């Protein structure tokens, strides 16, 4: 499977000028473009090396769509402020996520078009790409408006056409790097914590893609009720990092096994301290 995503944030700053608009685009776990309204000449720019050979036409159309959306968000933030009967001086946020997923055949599994206002769900297009989910009463007003105006068909036409068509093209531009995996380099570390117990940390380093499963097991049984897990973190080179830890009795280290699942690993790893 492959994915195309755009993460769009519009934050009004009353008294500090016009709202701040950022849209950042991803294919899978690799950022490929960004637009930031506060940049030099604000425009869509390549954020991956395989994007830099695109012509002036591609960038001008992308830049024009970002500027259209920027005005759409300033209007939408003002409209939402009236919907919620909010006062004039607060900063508020609209967020929009959109993109598409493709399978082994590289045809659309699902398209996304969903919004958050002030960090919470606002309205989302359903998997049918025909109906909307309003999170609250202000979003029911929005749902009535877009259903009458046939907004769903407008996004659906993009999701079924341009989004998949260009996501497949991006897979060609970055084929040598986007389709690669880096299997995790995994190790277990040991740190004493008491005179009674020890922390065993299972490490995974230098892996792409970001998706991974780490589990600790005792005598073949998941210890996820005792696991401390951090979020998968980016190394900064395109790879990711993660660890899972269990706290176990002194002298019991060799009874615990950590298991590693990753798209680069045909078989899951079993490691011991």
């Amino acid at each position: 499977p492959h994915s195309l995503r755009y993460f769009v944030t519009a934050v009004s700053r009353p008294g500090l000028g016009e709202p701040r608009f950022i849209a950042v685009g991803y294919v899978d776990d690799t950022q490929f473009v960004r637009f930031d309204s506060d940049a030099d000449n604000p425009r869509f720019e390549p954020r991956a090396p395989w994007m830099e050979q695109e012509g002036p036409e591609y960038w001008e159309e992308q830049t024009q769509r970002a500027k259209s959306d920027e005005q759409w968000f300033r209007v939408s933030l003002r409209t939402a402020q009236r919907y919620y009967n909010q006062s004039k001086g607060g900063s508020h946020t609209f967020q929009r996520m959109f993109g598409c997923d493709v399978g082994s055949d590289w045809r659309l599994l699902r398209g996304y078009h969903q919004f958050a206002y002030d960090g919470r769900d606002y309205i989302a297009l359903n998997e049918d790409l025909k109906t909307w989910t309003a999170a609250d009463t202000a979003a029911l007003i929005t749902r009535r408006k877009w259903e009458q105006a046939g907004d769903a068909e407008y996004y659906r036409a993009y999701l079924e056409g341009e989004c998949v068509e260009w996501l497949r093209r991006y897979l060609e531009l970055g084929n040598e790097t986007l389709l690669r995996t880096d299997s995790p380099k995994a190790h277990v570390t040991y740190h004493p914590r008491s005179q009674v117990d020890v922390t065993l940390r299972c490490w995974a380093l230098g892996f792409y893609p970001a998706d991974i499963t780490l589990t600790w097991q005792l005598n073949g049984e998941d210890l996820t009720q005792d696991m401390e897990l951090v979020e998968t973190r980016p190394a900064g080179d395109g790879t990711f990092q993660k660890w899972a830890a269990v706290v176990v009795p002194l002298g019991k280290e060799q009874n615990y096994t950590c298991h590693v699942h990753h798209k680069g690993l045909p078989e899951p790893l079993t490691l011991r301290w």
């Binding site: 959306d69 409209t79 939402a80 408006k145 105006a149 068509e165």
Partner: peptide
Amino acid sequence: YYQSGLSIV
């Protein structure tokens, strides 16, 4: 390929 919004919220 980015797409711009149509109807306002």
